[PDB]
Every structure is written in structure tokens, then in C-alpha cells.
């Protein structure tokens, strides 16, 4: 459901400063996460194509507004990982 | 949605305190999901309102085009502003 | 909307200022929300007329849409040249 | 506007001047804005005249105009990226 | 190969053990190799169904494109792992700066 | 070249000695101008298909249309694509060595770190 | 310049003397600057002949075709829509366009060199930090 995954990756998104080392190391989870998210989606659509080829229905739509939104999700994540880059240089930049 | 809603919103989002850099390289993968989702959001009413109809129906439909368009936009100016506080940090520690 | 007031506009937008360079940085994605609401607006009015018609006018609104596709370019465009106006600094230091 | 003078304009425009890099990046973005509007212009003024001949500088002597103001501004976009280029190539005949 | 079988294979291999940090760093290489390999010997079969199919035709289903899902995950498995590099990396700077 | 010969290869050669980090650390630019050499040649051998295959193109042409005087571009396509693989892969080992050597400057930060 | 050769040049150069570390890290440089060299020979060589191409063009399309001056010409009436095919089977096109494409070849194998010669300044680094740290 597409209100679902909205809700998660706003949840996923969100920065921990307290503990950044972890939030480095999770990002790489959730990278996972999302890819695979995105990637069952796309066998969900290959199977409804697969069935199409038997010859109201707004399922493949549907599934395609997913696959737009998991897309978003792995860039948002995978700039998440930057930011924690770039929170760290700061934090260092701001040290003598 | 109301389109000066979202111009409003945006003009507020897009701002950078540059006396809390940290929060805001943060932040913005929030902001980012926050548009995704009002990105998200918009497709999928789109299609609720195709699906349903399959004359004053087809305005409603162009109007959540526009609304669709200025969040894409966003979703660009997002991503961009994540840069620019890249940028910033960049020529702050050139500076030192 | 003038035209020429968007012209005069986009002319005093797109000006970097190098000795506040970190300003501009910041300000670049301001300038593209700017512009971004002006583009949003005319497509608003545009459908506004083309329902209310539902022609010359109608023309007249393209071409401050299409004015406000380039603004949107250039100041893209512009977010860019300074990163790279950064990068020749710190190359020359 | 005389095509001869555009032709010459642009001709002076894209020239790079190495020695002041910098500023021909920052500048760029301005002679975009003179290009944008003089090819804004002309299209105005062929509206206007559509309009006053829909009431009874040829029309297509504005069009040959139009058209090469678009060239340049093609000319002025890909200008930025050379002018980037010739950073690039600094920093790789340095080795940094 | 089955998709879900990738899933859970790159899920078990992107975790971070903190206490192990110098072997997740070096190990990360290995992770790469193996999943280039995945995503290069996906591409030959792919080669070889697509070959043969084209010899029959010149003399005269979803398979192929259920690879290329595969394949497309390979990628995403790859970025992945190049990702997890850098976040050992900035874990460390990390641990150095807090001391 | 077979492509699983490669794979066996690089992942031979990824593998980092933890005793030996220093001549590791010395040794993965030679890696590097080892797989270097390998995605340069294929690109040769790929030059050498590629003109071929406008010879064959040429030879279909003149094949129909009838002229002449007295299935060969489907085996030099097919031939290019098996090329066109282990071009890639060897564009990923590059990455790989190329992230090995960073890799090793990682670890003696930590091995440093560590030694307070 | 001989792919083959360029390969074994590189394959030499890198080489790291841990005994002269020194030496190595200073020489670096040199050979960065001498591989720079190469390449931007290569780029100039390509732009020569990618002008020796538009004359084998110009050459062959006039032999495949109806042209002004010349008396050899082609009995294969070859037509507009054939003539692409045509010229890049071409012998003489062939030839030049294959010199081009192994002088690109050179000039991607001398950016990949630049590459390792600047990874290997940073290795030789990298060990003398770890030396000194064994030390200390």
C-alpha cells in the first residue's frame, strides 16, 4: 500500500546525531531494504504482463506509482548516506 | 491541495540556516521525503480519478497535473539544496 | 506579468556576487522556488482561461511560461557555475 | 535586430577568456539572460503582429531571428560546460 | 537464480559487524568479486538464450526478462557494497574524531 | 579469454594478506596495470570483430541486390557480445582493485587508531 | 605507438622499490608528467587522422558515385540509401577509421595509466606512514 511505504521511509530517513556510526552502518541496510522493495515490485509487474499475454483492471498502474515511489526511496537513501558524510565533516570542521 | 499551499511550503522549506548547518544537511532527506510523498500522493489520485471515470472531471485532472508538476519541481529543488550545503561546508573549511 | 518586468527580474537574479560566494550558494535554491512558483502559476491561469474558453491572451501567458522554463534553466545553471567558481578557488590556493 | 549583428554578438559571447576563468563562469549565466531575452522579445513582437494582421520587420524575417537566438542559446548553455572543462583539464595535467 | 534468494543473500551481506571492523573492511572487496561475478554470469546466459533463439528464427518466453530483473538487482547489490565501503570508512573517522 | 577464468581470478586476487599490508599496499597498482592491460586488449579484439562486421554488413548488402562475383553477421555479432561481457567485468575489477587500495589505507588507520 | 608496448612501459613504470621510497615518491611525479605526455600526443595524432579520414571520405564517395574529375569509378551503381554500408566496408575508409579507433584505444589506456600513477603516489604514502608507525 502506497500510504505504507511512505510512512516507513519517513521513518528510515530520519537521523540519529547521537549515534552516527550507526546510522553510517544502517544506512547500508536499508539501502538493501529498499532494493529489494523495488526489486519485487518489478517481478509483480513482469508476472501481470506475463498474464496479459494470454490474448477496468488498474493494477499495473498502480504497481508502476510503487516502483516510482521505491526509486525516490533509494535515492532519498542513498543520499542519506551523504549527509552522514557531510554531518561528520562539520562536526570535525568545528573541532580544532 | 491548493497549489499557493505548496508554493508557500516549498519557499519556507528551501531556506538554509547557515548558523545550524548540521540540522540542516540532515533535515533535508526529511524534506525530501516529505515532497516524495506529496509527489506519490498526487499519481495516485490521478489515476483514482481515470479509474473513475472509466467534462468538468477532466479540469479537476489537469489541475493535479500542475500540482504534480510543481512537485517535481521541488523534488529537484531538494535534491539541489542538499548540494548546496555541501557547497557551503566546501568553501567555509577552504576558507580556514 | 509584464514580460519585461520578468527580463529585469531574471537579469538581477542570475548576478553572482563572489565575495559572497557561501550566500549565494544558499540563495540559488530561493531564487529556483521563486521562479518555480511563477512557472506554477501561469500553467494555473493558463487552465483557468482555457476552461473559462471551454485565444490571443493565451498566447501571451505561453510566452511568460516559456520565459520561466528558461529562468528555471539558467538558475540551475547558475547553482552549478558556483560550485565550480569553488572548485577554481580552492585548484589556484 | 539586424541577423548580422546577433551573429557577431554571439561571436564575441562565447569566446573564453583562460585567463579569467571565474568570472566567465559566473558571467555565463548572465549572457544567458540577454540571449533569453531577446529571444523572448521576438516572440512577443511576431504576436504582435499575428495579431495585428488577424484584424485585417516581416513575420519571417523575425522567425530567422527566433531561431538563431535559440542556437545561441544552445551556444551559452554548452559554454558553461566548456568553461568547466577547461577546470577539469587544469586539475587533470596536475595530477590533483 | 531466484530473486529472493538475492534479497537475502545481499540483506546478510551489507550488516556492519563494529567490533570486526578492519575484516569488514577488507572482506568488502570479496563481497564485490562475488557479486560482480553474479551480475557477469547472469549476462552470459542471457548472451547465450538470446543466441540460440536468434539461429532458430533465422532458419525458420518472460525467461529473459525475469533474468534482467535478476541482473538489475546484481547492480543495485554492487552499488550496495561499493556504498558499505565508504560507510566503513566514515565509521572510522568517526571512532578517531570521538577520541 | 573465458569470462569464468577472469572471475576466478580477480577473486584471487582481491584477497588482502593482513601480515603483509604494506607490500599489499604496494602490489595493488600492479593489479591494477595487470587488469588495465586485460580490458585494453579486449577493447583491441573488439576493434578488429567491429570492422569485420562491416565487412559482413557489406557482403549481406551486395548478397541480396545481386551483386557478387564468386549467417556470417549473426556469428560476428554474437562473438562481439561475448567480447562486450568480459569488457565489462574488467571494468568492474578496476573498480575493485581500484577500491582495494583504498581499502588498505582503511585498515592501517584502524590498526593505528587501535594502538591508542 | 604499439598498445603492447604502452602495456609493458606501465607494467615497468609502477613497480614500487621499497628501498628507495623516497626516490619512488618523487619520480612518481615525473612519470605522471611523462604519461600526460603520451596522451596528449595521442590527442594530437587522432586529430590528424580524423583529417586523413574526411579526404578517404571525400575520395571514396566520389568513386562510388558520380564525380568530376577521376576515371576509375565503380561498376556497382551503389544508391544513397546503400552508402553508408558501403564506405565503412571500404578498404581505404576501413583503414584510417581502424587507425582512429587504436589511437583512441592508446589514448583510454593512457588515461587508466594516469590513474594508477596517481593511486601509486598514494600507496608509496601509505607505506612510508605504516613504516613510520611500525617505527614509532
Redesign the interface.
Known sequence: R?EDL?EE??KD???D?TK??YE??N???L???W??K???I??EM?RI??QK?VA?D?SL??WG?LL??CS?????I????????????????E?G
Open positions: 502506497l511512505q521511509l519517513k530517513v530520519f537521523i546525531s552516527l556510526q553510517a552502518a544506512n547500508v541496510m539501502y538493501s531494504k532494493l529489494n523495488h526489486s519485487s518489478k517481478k513482469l504482463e506475463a499475454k477496468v488498474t498502474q498502480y506509482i516510482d515511489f525516490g526511496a533509494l535515492d532519498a542513498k543520499s542519506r548516506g551523504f549527509a552522514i558524510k557531510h554531518i561528520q565533516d562539520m562536526r570535525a570542521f573541532a
